[PDB]
Amino acid sequence: EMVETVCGPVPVEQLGKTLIHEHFLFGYPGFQGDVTRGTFREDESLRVAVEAAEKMKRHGIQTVVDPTPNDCGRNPAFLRRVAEETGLNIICATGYYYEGEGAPPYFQFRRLLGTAEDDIYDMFMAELTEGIADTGIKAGVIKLASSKGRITEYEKMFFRAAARAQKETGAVIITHTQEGTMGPEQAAYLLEHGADPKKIVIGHMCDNTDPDYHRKTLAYGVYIAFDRFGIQGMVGAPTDEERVRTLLALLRDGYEKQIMLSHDTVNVWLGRPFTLPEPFAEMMKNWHVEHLFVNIIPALKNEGIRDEVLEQMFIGNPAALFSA
Amino acid sequence: EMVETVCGPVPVEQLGKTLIHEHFLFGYPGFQGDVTRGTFREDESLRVAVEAAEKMKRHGIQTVVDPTPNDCGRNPAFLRRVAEETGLNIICATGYYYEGEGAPPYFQFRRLLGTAEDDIYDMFMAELTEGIADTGIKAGVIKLASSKGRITEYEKMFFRAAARAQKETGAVIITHTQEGTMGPEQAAYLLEHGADPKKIVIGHMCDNTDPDYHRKTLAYGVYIAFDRFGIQGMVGAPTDEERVRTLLALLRDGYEKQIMLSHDTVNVWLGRPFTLPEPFAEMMKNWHVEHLFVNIIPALKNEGIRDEVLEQMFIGNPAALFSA
Ligand SMILES: [Co+2]
Ligand SMILES: [Co+2]
Ligand SMILES: [Co+2]
Ligand SMILES: [Co+2]
Numbered sequence: 001e002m003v004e005t006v007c008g009p010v011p012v013e014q015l016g017k018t019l020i021h022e023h024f025l026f027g028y029p030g031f032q033g034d035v036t037r038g039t040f041r042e043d044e045s046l047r048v049a050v051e052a053a054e055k056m057k058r059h060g061i062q063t064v065v066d067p068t069p070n071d072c073g074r075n076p077a078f079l080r081r082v083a084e085e086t087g088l089n090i091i092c093a094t095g096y097y098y099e100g101e102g103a104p105p106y107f108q109f110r111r112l113l114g115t116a117e118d119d120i121y122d123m124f125m126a127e128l129t130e131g132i133a134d135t136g137i138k139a140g141v142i143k144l145a146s147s148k149g150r151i152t153e154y155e156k157m158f159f160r161a162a163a164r165a166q167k168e169t170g171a172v173i174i175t176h177t178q179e180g181t182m183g184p185e186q187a188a189y190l191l192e193h194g195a196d197p198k199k200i201v202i203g204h205m206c207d208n209t210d211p212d213y214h215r216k217t218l219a220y221g222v223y224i225a226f227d228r229f230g231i232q233g234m235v236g237a238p239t240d241e242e243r244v245r246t247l248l249a250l251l252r253d254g255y256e257k258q259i260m261l262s263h264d265t266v267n268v269w270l271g272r273p274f275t276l277p278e279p280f281a282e283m284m285k286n287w288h289v290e291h292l293f294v295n296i297i298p299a300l301k302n303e304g305i306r307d308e309v310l311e312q313m314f315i316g317n318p319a320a321l322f323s324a
Numbered sequence: 325e326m327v328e329t330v331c332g333p334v335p336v337e338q339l340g341k342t343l344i345h346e347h348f349l350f351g352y353p354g355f356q357g358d359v360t361r362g363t364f365r366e367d368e369s370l371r372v373a374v375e376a377a378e379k380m381k382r383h384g385i386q387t388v389v390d391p392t393p394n395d396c397g398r399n400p401a402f403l404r405r406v407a408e409e410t411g412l413n414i415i416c417a418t419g420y421y422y423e424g425e426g427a428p429p430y431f432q433f434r435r436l437l438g439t440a441e442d443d444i445y446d447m448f449m450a451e452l453t454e455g456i457a458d459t460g461i462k463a464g465v466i467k468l469a470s471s472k473g474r475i476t477e478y479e480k481m482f483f484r485a486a487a488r489a490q491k492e493t494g495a496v497i498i499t500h501t502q503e504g505t506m507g508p509e510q511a512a513y514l515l516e517h518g519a520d521p522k523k524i525v526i527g528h529m530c531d532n533t534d535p536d537y538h539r540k541t542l543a544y545g546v547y548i549a550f551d552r553f554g555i556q557g558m559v560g561a562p563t564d565e566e567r568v569r570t571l572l573a574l575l576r577d578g579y580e581k582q583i584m585l586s587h588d589t590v591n592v593w594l595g596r597p598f599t600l601p602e603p604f605a606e607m608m609k610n611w612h613v614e615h616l617f618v619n620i621i622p623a624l625k626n627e628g629i630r631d632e633v634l635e636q637m638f639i640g641n642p643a644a645l646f647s648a
Contacts, residue, residue: 029353030430033394033420035457036450037443070357096357105425106354106595113598119361126360133359271430274437 003322004128004138005063006080006090015089016062018318021174021203021227021262022289024049024066024082024090027073027270029103038271045268046081052267052289053086059293063089063318067143067174067203069097070123073270076137094127095143096120096158098178102145104154111157120161128169140322142166145176146186159186163193172321173200174225179237180208187220197221201260201321204228209242211249218250218258223321227262230291233283240286244299251305256312257320261296265289327646328452328462329387330404330414339413340386342642345498345527345551345586346613348373348390348406348414351397351594353427362596369592370405376591376613377410383617387413387642391467391498391527393421394447397594400461418451419467420444420482422502426469428478441481448489464646466490469500470510480513487517496645497524498549503560504532511544521545525584525645528552533566535573542574542582547645551586554615557607558600564610564620572627580636581644585620589613 002009025045031038056064068074076092083090096102110116127139142162146155162173173195177183183202190200197220205214206226217224226247232239250259265288276284286295297310326333349369355362380388392398403414420426434440451463466486470479486497497519501507507526514524521544529538530550541548550571556563562570574583589612600608610619621634 028429028433030395030420030427032356033398033427034430034443034447035394036455037447039457070359071354074357096354101429103354103357103427103429105352105427106358109352110596110598113600115598119358119596123358123361131360133363272434272443274434274439276437 001323003091004140005083006076006092006137007083010089012319012322015318015322017060017314018063018065019056019061019262019289020065020201020225020260020318021067021264022064023068023264023266024052024079025073025075025268025270026068026266028101029071029097031073031271034271040270042078046078048268049078049082050085052265053082053088055289057086057088059290061088063091065091065141065174067093067095067141069093069095069102069143069145071096071103072101076132077135080135080137091140092137093141093143093174094124094132094139095145095162098145098147098176099152099154100147100178107157108154111154117157117161120158121164124161124165125168128165128171141172141174143174143176144186146178146182148178149181151182151185151189156189159189160193163190163195166195166199170199170324175201175203177202177204177207180204180213183208183213183217183224184220187217187222191220199321201225204264206243206246207238209238209246211246214246214250215253218255223258223260223317225260225262227260228264229261229296230263230287231284232286233280240296244296248300248303251309256309257317259313260317261292261313263287263289263291327415328464329407330400330416330461331407334413336643336646339642339646341384341638342387342389343380343385343586343613344389344525344549344584344642345391345588346388347392347588347590348376348403349397349399349592349594350392350590352425353395353421355397355595358595362594364594366402370402372592373402373406374409376589377406377412380613381410381412383614385412387415389415389465389498391417391419391465393417393419393426393467393469395420395427396425400456400459404459404461415464416461417465417467417498418448418456418463419469419486422469422471422500423476423478424471424502431481432478435478435481441485444482445485445488448485449492452489452493452495465496465498467498467500468510470502470506472502473505475506475509475513483513484517487514487519490519490523494523494648499525499527501526501528501531504528504537507532507537507541507548508544511541511546515544523645525549528588530567530570531560531562533562533570535570538570538574539577542579547582547584547641549584549586551584552588553585553620554587554589554611555608557604568620568623568627572624572629575629575633580633581641583637584641585616585637587611587613587615
C-alpha cells in the first residue's frame with residue numbers, strides 16, 4: 001500500500017491525479033563530455049523544474065513518474081529538491097535507455113566478463129530496495145527500453161533482469177518503445193520471464209496509429225501509455241490529431257482501465273541549449289505539461305468521453321498500477 | 325616553448341622522460357548509471373593514482389600524457405591532485421572516444437541540429453585555450469579515435485574539428501586506432517585537412533603485427549605509438565612478444581625518431597570493480613606502469629637496442645612532438 005517517491009514512502013491511495021511519464025531533467029548520453037560549454041546551471045534548472053511542477057499542480061496533478069534513465073542524467077537528489085519545494089510526489093526509475101540513445105559500452109563490457117545480467121539485476125534490487133547512491137532515495141519503477149523493430153541482445157539483459165526484480169519486489173515496470181514498434185513483443189517477452197502484466201506499462205504507444213497494434217498489446221493485460229502528447233513534426237511521426245483518433249477507438253472498445261496519458265516533456269535539457277528550425281518549433285509548440293489539460297482533454301470531452309473515464313485514466317489506473 | 329599541464333604551463337625542455345599514453349582514471353560510457361554499486365571513492369582512488377605516479381617516478385618518468393576522453397570519465401582536477409602530491413607532470417586531453425566505446429547520442433543529436441562540428445571545434449578551443457569546466461586546467465592534447473576499418477561520419481566531425489583547432493593553436497593530436505586499422509587513413513585524413521604531421525601521434529599501432537602497415541603510416545611523417553604493452557589475451561591483442569618483434573623491425577629500419585612507447589594502463593576503473601577469469605587474468609598480469617621498465621626495455625636491450633635509441637623514444641621524441 002506504499003510506493004517509494006524521492007521523498008520516501010507515500011501511500012498509494014494518496015497519489016491522486018498522476019502524470020505517468022515526464023522528465024524534469026534529461027540529457028542524451030555524451031552530454032557529460034560537453035561540460036565546459038554545456039554547464040548544468042542548477043539554480044535556474046531548479047526554478048524551471050519548480051515552475052513546471054506548479055503548472056501541473058494547477059491542473060490537479062499530485063504525482064509525477066519521472067522515468068529518466070540512469071545513463072541519461074537521472075538526478076534523484078535534484079528531483080527531491082523539486083518535490084520539497086512544491087509538495088508534488090515524484091517517483092523515479094532505475095534502468096538504462098535503448099541502444100540508440102543510451103550508453104551501452106559499460107554493460108556490454110560486463111557482458112564480456114559474463115556478469116552483466118546479474119549486475120543489472122543487482123543494480124535494480126539495490127535501487128528499488130536499498131537506495132540510489134548516497135541519497136537514501138529509492139526508485140519506484142524500473143525503466144526498460146527497446147530499439148526500432150528489435151529488442152537487442154543488450155536490451156534483453158535488462159528485460160530479463162527487470163522480470164527477475166519484479167518477481168522479487170512487485171516493482172512496476174515502465175517502458176519505452178521506439179518508433180511505434182515492439183509493444184506486443186515487450187509484453188510477450190516480459191510475461192514469458194514471469195513478469196506481472198498488471199505491473200507493466202508499455203510506453204510510447206501513441207506513436208503507432210493502427211489500433212490493431214494496440215489491441216495486440218492490450219491482449220496481454222498490460223497497461224499502455226499514450227505518453228507523448230504534444231510531440232509533433234518529425235517526418236513519419238504522428239500528430240496529436242492522430243493520437244486522439246487512435247485513443248478514441250480504444251476507449252470505444254472499453255479499454256480505459258488499461259490506458260494512461262502523458263507528454264514525455266523534457267523541462268530542463270542537460271548539455272548545451274538548442275533551438276529547433278521555425279517550422280519544426282511551431283509544430284512542437286504544444287509540447288508542455290499543461291497540454292493534456294488545456295487541449296487534449298477538452299477535445300476528448302468534445303467527443304463525448306465522460307469524466308469517469310478520464311478519472312479512470314489519471315487517478316484509478318495509477319492507483320491500481322502501484323497497488324499489490 | 326610551453327605545454328599546458330594539469331598544473332599549468334611547463335617548459336617543453338623540462339618534460340624529460342615521458343609516457344605518452346596512460347590513464348589514471350577511465351570508465352566505459354555508461355559507468356555513471358552504475359553509481360550505486362560503482363561509486364567513485366576519491367580518497368582510495370587518489371591513493372592508488374599517487375602510487376602509480378610514484379612507481380613511474382622510480383623509473384625516471386617526469387611526464388605522463390593522459391588521453392582519457394571527455395566521455396570516458398576525464399577528471400582534470402583529480403589529475404591535478406595527483407600531480408600536486410607527486411610533482412609528476414600530467415598532460416590531459418580534449419576529445420571524444422570512437423563510437424563502439426563512446427557516447428555518441430549527444431553529438432549525433434547536435435549533428436541533426438546542424439551545429440555539432442562547430443560545437444566540437446568550440447569545445448576544443450575552449451579546453452585548449454581557456455579551461456576545462458571550472459578547473460582552470462587547459463588540455464595539452466586533442467584525443468581522436470576511429471572505429472574498426474572505418475572513420476565514421478560521427479568520428480570525422482571530431483577529426484575535422486581537431487585539424488581546424490590544430491591549425492589555430494599548434495596543439496598536439498593523439499589518436500586511438502581500433503584493432504590495428506586506419507593508421508594510414510587517419511594520417512591522410514588529418515593532413516588533408518591541414519594538420520601538421522609533426523604534431524600527430526597515431527596510437528595503438530602495436531595491435532598490428534605487419535610492419536608494412538606501420539611503414540605506410542610512417543611515410544606520412546607522423547609519430548606512431550606502441551602504447552599497449554602488457555595488454556595480451558583480450559580484445560584480440562597481440563602478445564608482447566609480437567609487439568617487440570614488430571618494434572625491433574622498425575627500429576632496425578631506423579624509425580626511432582617517429583616511435584613512442586606506453587602501456588595504456590587504467591589505474592583506477594570507474595564504475596563497479598571487476599576481476600578477469602584466471603586464464604585471462606594471468607595473461608594480463610604485466611599490464612601496469614612499471615612493465616616497460618622492468619620487462620620490455622630489458623628485452624629490447626637483450627636484442628641490441630642501445631640507450632641512445634631508448635632515450636630518443638622516451639625523451640627526444642616527446643620534446644620534439646611538443647615543440648613548435
Ligand atoms: Co522514451
Ligand atoms: Co521519456
Ligand atoms: Co584507446
Ligand atoms: Co587509452
